Amino acid sequence: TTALVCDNGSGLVKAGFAGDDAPRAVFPSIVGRPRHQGVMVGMGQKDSYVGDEAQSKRGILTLKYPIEHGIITNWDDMEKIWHHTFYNELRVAPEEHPTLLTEAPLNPKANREKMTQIMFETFNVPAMYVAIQAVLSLYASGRTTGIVLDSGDGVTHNVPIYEGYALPHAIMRLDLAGRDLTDYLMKILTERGYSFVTTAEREIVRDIKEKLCYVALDFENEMATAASSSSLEKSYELPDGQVITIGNERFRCPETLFQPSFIGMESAGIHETTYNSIMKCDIDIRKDLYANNVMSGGTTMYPGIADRMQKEITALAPSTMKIKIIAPPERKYSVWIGGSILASLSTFQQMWITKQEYDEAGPSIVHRKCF
Amino acid sequence: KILTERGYSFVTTAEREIVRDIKEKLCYVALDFENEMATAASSSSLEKSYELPDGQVITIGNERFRCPETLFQPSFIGMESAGIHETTYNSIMKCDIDIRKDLYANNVMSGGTTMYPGIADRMQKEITALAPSTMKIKIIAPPERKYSVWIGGSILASLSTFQQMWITKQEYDEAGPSIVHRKCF
Amino acid sequence: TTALVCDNGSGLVKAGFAGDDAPRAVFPSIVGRPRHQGVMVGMGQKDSYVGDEAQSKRGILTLKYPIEHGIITNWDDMEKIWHHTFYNELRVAPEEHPTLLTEAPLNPKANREKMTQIMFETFNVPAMYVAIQAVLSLYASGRTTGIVLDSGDGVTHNVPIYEGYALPHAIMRLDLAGRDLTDYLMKILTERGYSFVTTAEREIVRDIKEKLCYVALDFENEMATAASSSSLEKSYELPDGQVITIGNERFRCPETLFQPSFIGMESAGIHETTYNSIMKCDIDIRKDLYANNVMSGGTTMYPGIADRMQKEITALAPSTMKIKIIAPPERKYSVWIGGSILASLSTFQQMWITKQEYDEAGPSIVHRKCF
Amino acid sequence: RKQQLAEECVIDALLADIRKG
Ligand SMILES: Nc1ncnc2c1ncn2[C@@H]1O[C@H](COP(=O)(O)OP(=O)(O)O)[C@@H](O)[C@H]1O
Ligand SMILES: Nc1ncnc2c1ncn2[C@@H]1O[C@H](COP(=O)(O)OP(=O)(O)O)[C@@H](O)[C@H]1O
Ligand SMILES: [Mg+2]
Ligand SMILES: [Mg+2]
Numbered sequence: 001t002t003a004l005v006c007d008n009g010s011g012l013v014k015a016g017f018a019g020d021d022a023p024r025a026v027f028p029s030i031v032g033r034p035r036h037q038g039v040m041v042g043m044g045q046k047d048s049y050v051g052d053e054a055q056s057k058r059g060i061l062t063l064k065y066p067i068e069h070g071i072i073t074n075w076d077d078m079e080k081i082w083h084h085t086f087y088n089e090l091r092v093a094p095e096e097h098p099t100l101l102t103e104a105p106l107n108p109k110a111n112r113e114k115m116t117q118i119m120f121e122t123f124n125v126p127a128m129y130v131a132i133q134a135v136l137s138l139y140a141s142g143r144t145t146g147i148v149l150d151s152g153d154g155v156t157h158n159v160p161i162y163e164g165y166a167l168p169h170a171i172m173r174l175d176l177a178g179r180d181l182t183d184y185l186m187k188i189l190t191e192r193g194y195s196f197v198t199t200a201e202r203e204i205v206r207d208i209k210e211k212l213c214y215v216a217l218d219f220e221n222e223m224a225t226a227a228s229s230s231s232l233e234k235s236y237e238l239p240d241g242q243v244i245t246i247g248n249e250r251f252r253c254p255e256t257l258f259q260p261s262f263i264g265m266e267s268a269g270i271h272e273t274t275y276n277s278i279m280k281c282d283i284d285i286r287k288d289l290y291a292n293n294v295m296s297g298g299t300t301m302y303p304g305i306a307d308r309m310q311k312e313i314t315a316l317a318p319s320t321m322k323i324k325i326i327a328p329p330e331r332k333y334s335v336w337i338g339g340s341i342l343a344s345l346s347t348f349q350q351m352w353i354t355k356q357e358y359d360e361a362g363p364s365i366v367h368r369k370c371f
Numbered sequence: 372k373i374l375t376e377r378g379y380s381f382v383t384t385a386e387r388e389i390v391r392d393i394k395e396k397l398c399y400v401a402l403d404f405e406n407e408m409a410t411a412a413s414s415s416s417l418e419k420s421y422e423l424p425d426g427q428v429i430t431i432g433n434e435r436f437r438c439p440e441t442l443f444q445p446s447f448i449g450m451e452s453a454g455i456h457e458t459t460y461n462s463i464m465k466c467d468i469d470i471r472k473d474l475y476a477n478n479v480m481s482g483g484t485t486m487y488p489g490i491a492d493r494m495q496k497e498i499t500a501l502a503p504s505t506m507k508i509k510i511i512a513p514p515e516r517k518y519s520v521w522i523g524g525s526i527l528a529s530l531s532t533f534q535q536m537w538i539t540k541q542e543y544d545e546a547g548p549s550i551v552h553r554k555c556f
Numbered sequence: 557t558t559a560l561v562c563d564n565g566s567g568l569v570k571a572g573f574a575g576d577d578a579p580r581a582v583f584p585s586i587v588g589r590p591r592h593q594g595v596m597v598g599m600g601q602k603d604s605y606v607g608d609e610a611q612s613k614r615g616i617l618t619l620k621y622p623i624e625h626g627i628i629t630n631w632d633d634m635e636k637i638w639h640h641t642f643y644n645e646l647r648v649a650p651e652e653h654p655t656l657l658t659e660a661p662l663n664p665k666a667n668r669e670k671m672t673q674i675m676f677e678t679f680n681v682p683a684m685y686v687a688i689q690a691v692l693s694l695y696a697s698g699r700t701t702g703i704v705l706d707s708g709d710g711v712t713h714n715v716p717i718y719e720g721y722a723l724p725h726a727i728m729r730l731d732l733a734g735r736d737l738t739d740y741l742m743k744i745l746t747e748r749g750y751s752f753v754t755t756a757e758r759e760i761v762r763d764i765k766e767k768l769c770y771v772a773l774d775f776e777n778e779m780a781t782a783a784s785s786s787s788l789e790k791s792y793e794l795p796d797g798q799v800i801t802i803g804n805e806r807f808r809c810p811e812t813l814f815q816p817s818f819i820g821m822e823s824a825g826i827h828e829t830t831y832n833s834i835m836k837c838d839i840d841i842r843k844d845l846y847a848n849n850v851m852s853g854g855t856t857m858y859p860g861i862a863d864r865m866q867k868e869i870t871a872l873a874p875s876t877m878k879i880k881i882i883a884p885p886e887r888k889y890s891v892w893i894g895g896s897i898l899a900s901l902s903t904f905q906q907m908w909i910t911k912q913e914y915d916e917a918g919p920s921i922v923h924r925k926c927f
Numbered sequence: 928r929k930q931q932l933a934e935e936c937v938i939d940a941l942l943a944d945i946r947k948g
Contacts, residue, residue, distance in 0.1 A: 001935075035822060039556060042532040042940040059469030062822060193627075193664040197731075198822050200469050240471040241503035264725035350928070451591060451618055451754045526944035 001126070004092065005339035006085060007102040007133070008078075010067045011153025011178060012298065013051075014336045015085050018343035023336040025089035027051045031077040032061035050084040055203065063199040069175040070104035070155040071111055075118070082123055098127035098352060100339050104155040105132055106173040109367065116363045120355060127352035130370050131342070134159035135166070137296035139338030141326060145285070146292035149274055150335070151299035153178045156257070156270055158277040162285040166371070170280035172273055176260055178299050182206050184263055185213070185253045194244055208236055208246070209253060215304035216251035217311065219258075223248060254302050258312070271312035290317055293325045298332045373434050393421055393431070394438060400489035401436035402496065404444075408433060439487045443497065456497035475502060478510040483517040560648075560655040561895030562641060563689070564634075566623045567709025567734055568854065569607075570892045571641045574899040579892045581645035583607040587633040588617030606640040614756045625710040625731045626660035627667055631674070638679055654683040654908060656899050658891060660711040661688055662729045665923060672922045676914050683908035686926045690715035691722065692894025693852035697882055701841070702848030705830055706891065707813070707855040709734040712826060714833040718841045722927070726836040728829050732816055734855045738762045740819050741769075741809045750800055764792055764802070765809055771860035772807035773867070775814075779804065810858045814868070827868035834873075843877060850882045852890045 003018035009029070016024035032054030038045050054061055066077035086094050101115060112130060119128050134148035138161055141148075147160040157173045159166060186196045186205050196205050212234050216222040226232045226248040233247040256262045258269040267273075278289050293309065300306075306327040314323045328334060342348055353369050374381060374390065381390050397419050401407035411417045411433040418432040441447045443454040453461070463474045478498070480491075491512040498508045515522065527533055538554050559574040565585065572580035588610030594601050602609075610617055622633035642650050657671065668686060675684050690704035694717055697704075703716040714728040742752050742761050752761050768790050772778035782788045782804040789803040812818045814825040824832070834845050849869065851862070862883040870879045884890065898904055913921050 035817070036820070037556070040937055041527075041536060042530060043937045059467040187662070190662045191665045193666065195731075198467065200467060204468075237505065238468065240468050241506040243503075264723065446591065449592065451756075525948060526941060529944045529947040530940070532940075 001096065001098070003098045003100065003343035004090070004094070005100045005336055005343055006082075007335050007339065008067070008081070009102070009152045009335075010065070010070060010155065013081060013085055014333060015090060016336060016340065017090075018340050020340055021337070023333050025085060026333075027085075027089065028055060029065060029067060029081055030054045030063045031066060031074075031080055032058065032063045034060060035062045036060055048080060050080050051089075058200040058203055061200070063202070065179075068154060070152075071108055072114070075114065079118060079122060082118070086123060094123045094125055097125070098129075098343070099125055100343050101128065101130050102133045102136065102335055102339065103130050104152075104173065105134070105157055105159060105171050112366055112370075113363045116353075116358070116366045120358050120363075124355065127354055129348075129352055130366060131339070132159060132166075132371055133157075133335045134296070135161065135371075136335045136338030136342060137294055137331075139341045140296075140334040141294045141328065141338075143292055143294070143326075145288040146294045146326070147274060147277060147289045148294045148296060149270060149300075151177050151257070151270070151295075151297040153298070156273075156297075156299065158270075158273050160277055160281050160289055162281070162288060167281055170277045172277055172280075174260075174267060174270070174273055176257065176263075176265060176267075177297075178206070178209070180263060181253050181256060181299075182209055184256055185209050185249060188249050188252055189246070192244070192246070192249075204238065208244075210301070212236055212246060213250045213253045213302060215254045215257075215302040215308050217304055217307055219251070219255055222251050226251075251304075254305070257299070258308070269312075271309060271316065274309075275313060275316045287321065290321055291324045293323070295325065295327050296331045296334045300327065300331060373437060374429075374431070376434075377429070377431065379429055389423065393429075395486070397421055397431060398435050398438050398487060400439045400487040400493050402489055402493050404436075404440060407436055411436075436489075439490070442484065442490075443493065454497075456494055456501065459494075460498060460501045472506065475506050476509045478508065480510065480512055481516045481519045485512065486517060557653060559899035560646075560650075560653050561658075561892050561899055562638075562655055563658040563892050563895065564623065564628075564637070565658075565708055565854075566626060566711060567621070569637060569641055570889055571646060572892060572896070573646075574896050576896055577893075579889045581641060582889070583641075583645065584611060585621060585623060585637055586610045586619040587622060587630075587636055588613065588619050590616060591618045592616055604636065606636050607645070611759065614759060617756070619755045619758075621735075623710065624735075626663055626708075628671070631670060635674060635678070638674075642679065650679045650681050653681070654685075654899070655681050656685045656687060656895055658689045658692065658895070659686050660708075660729070661690070661713055661715060661727050668922050668926075669919045672909070672914070672919045676911065676919075680911070683910055685908055686922060687895075687898070688715060688722070688927060689713075689891045689894075690852075691717065692891045692898060693850055693887075694894075695897045696852070696890040696894040697848075697850045697884070699848055699850070699882075701844045702850045702882070703830060703833060703845045704850045704852060705826060705856070707733050707826070707851075707853040709854065712813070712829075712853075712855070714826075714830050716833055716837055716845055718837070718844065723837055724927075726833050728833045728836075730816075730821075730823055730826070730829055732813065732819070732821055732823070733853075734762075734765075736819055737809050737812055737855070738765055740812055741765050741805065744805055744808060745802070748800070748802065748805075760794065764800075768792060768802060769806045769809045769858060771810045771858040771864050773860055773864055775807070775811055778807050782807075810855075810861070813855070814864070825868075827865055827872065830865075831869060831872045846873060847878055847880045848882060849880065852887045854888050856883065856887055 004015065005018060006015040011028060012026055013029045014023045014026045028051070032049040033047065049057060049061060054063060064074065064077060066072060066074045066081060072078045086092060099119065103112065115130065119125060134150045134157065137148045137150055138146050144164055145162045147158060149156070149158050154177050155173060155175065156177050157171065159171045182202055182205050185208065189196060189205065230247065232250065233245050234250065235243050235245045237243050258271060260267055260269060274293065278286050281289060293313065295309065306325045309325045310323050317323055330337070351369060353365060357365055415432065417435060418430050419435065420428055420430045422428050443456055445452050445454060459478065463471055466474065491510050495508050495510050502508055513519065538550060542550055560571065561574060562571040567584060568582055569585045570579045570582045584607065586607065588605035605613055605617060610619055620630065620633055622628055622630045622637055628634045642648060659668065675681060690706050690713065693704040693706055694702045700720060701718045703714060705712065705714050710731065710733050712730045712733050716723055716726050738758060738761055741764065745752060745761065788806065789801050790806065791799050791801045793799055814827060816823050816825060830849065834842050837845060862881045866879050866881045873879060907925065909921060909925055
C-alpha cells in the first residue's frame with residue numbers, strides 16, 4: 001500500500017507517489033467557469049474546467065482560486081480540485097492509498113477540520129496526515145536543524161527547528177507571496193500602458209513574473225542603472241503577438257518581499273521576519289540557525305534571491321558569525337520531495353490518522369495527532 | 372452610378388438585374404488599388420466586354436475593380452464606417468487577448484459578396500498589414516461559400532441534440548410571440 | 557494672478573477660473589473633420605472643427621474623441637482641444653496664468669510625461685500641477701474623509717481618503733462609464749427598430765441617455781412593470797422630426813454600471829467595487845467611509861442612483877451602521893469646483909511645478925511632485 | 928498493532944452532420 005503526497009498549495013497543486021524523485025502531476029489550482037453564451041449545441045459543454053484545461057481555454061473563462069492565503073474559501077471548488085488530481089491526473093483510487101497533505105502554520109482550525117471531514121467522508125481514505133510544509137522542506141534538505149522560510153503563492157512563513165525540535169512561539173506567518181506580486185506587477189505594468197484586468201491576464205502577468213523578473217542585489221543602484229541606461233530592459237511576446245518591454249519592473253516586483261510597504265502592509269520584510277524568528281529562539285541554537293537558512297517554495301526561484309538573503313541577514317547578524325543560505329536548485333518541489341521522504345519513512349506508519357481513530361474521535365483528533 | 376461615366380444609363384429596377392449580372396460576371400477585387408488604376412489608365416488590357424439582352428455590347432475598364440473596392444473603402448458611397456478588413460480586425464481587438472491567435476488562423480468568409488476572385492489575397496494583405504508580424508493570417512475561402520449558410524442549416528437540423536431546442540406550438544400558445552426572444556439568441 | 561482649473565474630461569472639457577462657483581467653459585472634447593467633398597469654393601471652410609462648432613455642424617463631420625478611458629491617444633487633437641479652450645473659450649494667454657490639470661488614477665506615466673512636455677513647451681506656463689479628481693470631489697463635498705466614486709465618460713474609479721491620507725493600495729479603477737453606456741444604448745436601440753451607426757448619431761443617443769434614462773430601484777420589478785404595462789414608455793423627438801418611444805431601455809442602460817456583464821466585462825459592479833475598496837482599507841476607518849460615500853461625475857445623475865447604491869451597500873455591509881450616500885445636486889462640475897477650492901488655497905502655492913524645476917529635472921519631476 | 932500488521936467536441940459533431948449532408 002504505497003502513499004500519495006498532495007501539496008495543495010495556493011497556486012500550484014503538486015501531487016505524486018511516495019519514494020519518487022520528481023512530483024508526477026504539477027498543475028495550477030484554478031476552477032474556470034464560462035462567462036459568455038454557448039451558441040454551438042452539442043460538443044459536451046462543461047460547466048467547469050479544472051486545471052490545465054482551464055489554463056488552455058482561459059480566454060472565455062472566469063478563473064477562481066479556491067485557496068486564498070492558505071485558507072480554503074470555496075469548498076466545492078476545492079472538492080473539484082481534489083477530484084481532478086485524484087481521478088484525472090494520477091488516476092488512483094484514494095480508498096486504497098494514504099494521503100499526506102501540507103498546510104501552512106497558524107491556520108484556522110476549522111479549515112483543518114474541514115479537510116479532515118472531506119478527506120475522510122468524500123474521498124475516504126485508509127489514512128491521511130496533515131503536515132507543516134517547512135518540516136518537509138527541512139526533510140528534503142536532509143539537515144535536522146535549520147530555519148525554513150517557505151514562500152508559496154499565498155503564504156510566506158518562517159519555522160525554526162533545532163535538532164529535531166520545532167519552536168512554535170518563533171513560528172511566524174506573513175500573507176505576502178506570488179499572487180500579491182502578480183497583482184502588484186499589474187499595478188506597476190499600468191505605468192507603461194499595458195492594461196490587465198481579467199482573471200485570464202493574471203496568468204500572463206504571472207508568466208511575465210516567472211520568466212523575466214529577478215531579485216536585485218542592491219535596489220537603489222539597480223534603480224539608478226535602469227533609470228540611466230536601457231540595458232536591463234527586456235522584451236516579452238504576448239499570446240496575441242504583441243511585444244511588451246519592461247525595465248525596472250523586473251526588480252520592483254520581487255522587492256515587495258523585502259519592502260512590504262509597497263502594497264501598504266505594515267509588516268517588515270522576509271529578512272526581518274527571519275531575523276526576528278531567530279531572535280525569538282533560544283540563545284544557544286542561533287549558531288546553527290544562522291548557518292542553515294533553508295529557503296523553499298516557488299517564490300524563491302528568482303536568480304538573485306540567495307545573495308540578497310545572505311546580504312540582508314549578514315547586515316542584521318553580528319559580523320563574527322557566518323551566514324549560509326541553503327538554496328537547492330529543486331527547491332520548488334522540496335515540499336513534495338520531503339513529503340515523499342516522510343511517507344517512505346518506516347517510523348511514520350504509527351502516526352497515520354486512521355479511519356477508525358477518526359470515527360472514534362470525531363474530526364477532532366487532527367488537532368492532537370498532528371502538530 | 373459609375374456605369375453612367377462611360378455612357379451607359381440604367382435607371383429602372385429591371386436594369387438592376389443587368390447591372391447585378393455585370394457585377395457578378397466581370398468584376399474582380401484588385402490586389403493593389405493604385406497600381407491597378409495606373410495599369411487601367413495606361414493600357415486597355417483590363418477592359419472586358421459584355422452583351423446586353425437587346426444586343427448592344429458594353430466594354431468596362433477600371434469599373435471592374437472600382438465597384439468591389441467599396442467593401443474595403445466605404446467612403447465611395449459616403450458612409451462613415453470602416454472597411455471590412457478593419458471591421459474584422461476591430462472585432463478581433465474587441466475580443467479577449469488569449470483567443471486572438473485562433474481568430475487569426477480561422478478567418479472564415481461566407482456569402483456571395485466574397486465571390487470576387489481577388490478578395491482572399493487582398494484581405495490577407497490587409498490583415499497582415501494590420502496584425503503584428505509574428506502571426507499567421509489564414510483565411511478560409513471554400514468554393515461553396517455562397518450557400519454555406521444553408522449548408523450549416525442542414526448541418527444543424529441533422530443534429531440529434533437540436534431537437535429539444537425548437538419553439539413548439541404549445542409554448543407559443545402560452546407565451547405569446549415573445550418566447551422567440553428568450554429561446555433563441 | 558488667477559489660477560486655471562481645466563478638467564480635461566473624457567467626454568466634456570470643463571475649464572474655468574479659481575474662486576468661482578460655476579465652470580466658465582463646458583464643451584465636449586470632439587475634433588471634427590469633413591468627410592465629404594467641398595464644392596463651394598471659399599467662405600472659410602475649416603479643415604477641422606473643435607468643440608461646439610463640431611457639435612453644431614456634426615451632420616457632415618467625422619468626430620474624433622482624443623481621450624479614450626482617460627488616456628490621451630491622439631496628441632495633435634488634444635493640442636487642438638487645449639488651443640481652443642485657452643484661446644477661443646476662455647481667451648487668455650496660458651503664459652500669464654498657472655493651470656492645474658486633472659487626471660484619473662492609474663494613468664500610464666508617459667501620458668503625464670507628454671502633458672507636462674506639451675504644457676511646458678508650446679502652451680508654456682509659469683506653473684502646472686496634476687492631481688486626482690476624487691480628492692477634488694472630497695474637497696467639493698467639504699469633508700475630510702470619504703470614499704469617492706467618480707464616473708466620467710471613460711473612467712469609473714473609487715478612491716478612499718481618511719484624514720487627508722489617500723490609501724493608494726485601495727484605489728480601484730474600472731473602464732466602464734458614459735461612452736460604454738452610450739454604445740450599449742446604441743446596441744439595444746436596434747431592437748426597437750432604430751438604427752444609429754454614425755458618430756453624429758452618437759450625440760443623439762447620448763442625448764437620449766441624458767434626457768430619458770434612469771436607474772431602476774429594483775431591476776426585476778421594473779422588468780415586470782415595463783413588460784406588463786406601457787406606463788414607463790417615453791417619447792423623444794429626433795432632429796429630423798421622427799418620434800421614438802423607448803421602454804425598458806431607460807433602465808437597461810444605467811444597469812450596466814451595476815451589472816458589467818452586459819457589455820462582456822468580467823469585473824463586478826460599482827457597488828461591489830466601492831465595497832471592496834472599503835474592505836481594502838484598515839478596519840478602524842470603515843465606519844467613517846460608510847457615512848461619507850461621495851458620488852461625483854456626469855454619469856451619477858440618473859435620478860434613482862442614490863437610493864439604489866444605498867440599498868446595495870446596505871445589503872452588502874452589515875446592519876449595525878449608517879450608509880449615507882453623499883450625492884449633491886451639482887455633482888457634474890464638482891471636480892472643477894474642487895479645483896476652485898484647491899487652486900484658491902494659499903497653502904497650495906508651494907507645490908506648483910515651476911519652469912525652472914522642469915528645466916532642471918526634465919519631465920521627471922511630475923512623478924516626484926504629483927501623487 | 929502487532930495483530931493489525933499480521934493482518935496486512937465541435938469537430939466530431941460537425942463532421943457527423945457534414946457526412947449526413
Ligand atoms: N521560475 C519562476 N520564477 C519566479 N516565480 C516563480 C517561478 N516559478 C514559480 N513561481 C512562483 O511560485 C509559485 C509556485 O510556488 P508553489 O509553492 O508551487 O505554489 P503553490 O504550491 O501554492 O501552487 C507560483 O505561484 C509562481 O508565482
Ligand atoms: N444629465 C445627465 N444624466 C446622465 N448622464 C449624463 C448627464 N449629463 C452628462 N452625462 C454623462 O456624463 C458624461 C460627462 O462626464 P464628465 O463630467 O465629463 O466626467 P469626466 O470629466 O470625468 O470625463 C457624459 O459623457 C454623459 O454621457
Ligand atoms: Mg506554494
Ligand atoms: Mg469628471
